[PDB]
Structure formats: C-alpha cells, structure tokens
Amino acid sequence: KVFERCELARTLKRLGMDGYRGISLANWMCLAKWESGYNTRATNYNAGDRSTDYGIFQINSRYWCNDGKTPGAVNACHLSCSALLQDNIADAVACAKRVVRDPQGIRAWVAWRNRCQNRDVRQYVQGCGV
Numbered sequence: 001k002v003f004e005r006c007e008l009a010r011t012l013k014r015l016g017m018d019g020y021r022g023i024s025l026a027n028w029m030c031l032a033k034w035e036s037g038y039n040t041r042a043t044n045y046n047a048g049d050r051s052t053d054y055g056i057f058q059i060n061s062r063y064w065c066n067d068g069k070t071p072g073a074v075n076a077c078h079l080s081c082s083a084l085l086q087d088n089i090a091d092a093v094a095c096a097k098r099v100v101r102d103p104q105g106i107r108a109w110v111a112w113r114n115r116c117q118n119r120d121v122r123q124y125v126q127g128c129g130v
Contacts, residue, residue: 001039001040001041001087002037002038002039002040003032003038003039003040003056004038005029005038005124005128006127006128006129006130008029008032008038009025009029009124009125009128009130010128010129010130011089012025012028012029012093013025013130015089015090015093017093017096017097018130020097020100021097021100021101021105022105023100023105023106024121025125025130026121026122026124026125027106027112027116027121028096029121029124029125030112030115030116030119030121030124031057031106031109031111031112031116032056032057033115033124034111034112034114034115034116035053035056035057035058035109035111036055036056036057036058038056039056040055040056040085040086040087040089040092041055041085042054042055042056042058043055043085044058049062050069050070050071051070052067052070052081054067054081054084054085055084055085055089055092056084056089056092057084057092057095057096057099057109058109058111059077059081059084059092059095059096059099061073061081062074063076064076064077064079064095064098064099065077065079065080065081065083065084065095066079066080066081067080067081067082076098076099077094077095077098077099079091079094079095083095
C-alpha cells in the first residue's frame, strides 16, 4: 500500500509515534518519505553485505527482522521480515520503536541524517489534523 501523506500522519499518531523516545511525528514522516515514499511494499537488496531493507521504514534484515538468508542475523524485533511488507503497519511500527530504543535513536537511519536532521520538517504534517 502507498499511503497518502495525511493518512499516514494520522495512523502513526494513533499508534503512539508522536514523541516516542523524543522523536516528533514530523520526523517519523520525513523518515518514511525518504526511505520508501510511504510504500509498505518497498524492498531494497544490499548486494554489498547480503542484507535487505524492508517496508515503509526500510528496516534491515541483519539486525532487526529475520529473512533467513542474511548472514549474522540478530532479529532484535523478533519478527519475520514478511511482517514488514503488510498493508497494516502495526508490526513495522512496533519494530521501528525497538530500533530507536538503542543509543543512536532515529540516527540509526542514514537517510534521516541526510534529509531530515536540522531541517524544517513541519511540511510533512501540515494540514493533517495531527
């Protein structure tokens, strides 16, 4: 499923993402925008290290979810990577919350540093009623 901007904003707020571990809703939106374009089916294979990024937040298979074909997999979210490709983003959100519980927080995603950090991210939630 490809979410409409405000539809996703309201969904994430209901799932308790606003202010989770100090991260504003606009930051989560900025992350989803640049990682997958709000697409739950997005998948990116990293030929360099044999890992794959899954879903709307592009969660990696080496540390977070299990896909069975990634060497040195940890599976910290205790989820099959298949769960991160559903139209229902509940599992993806639960795993994203786990990612930010680590020291790096939202900085765990390089795209956030490049496209969201120190920027005016209000545009991602403007007019959504959140």
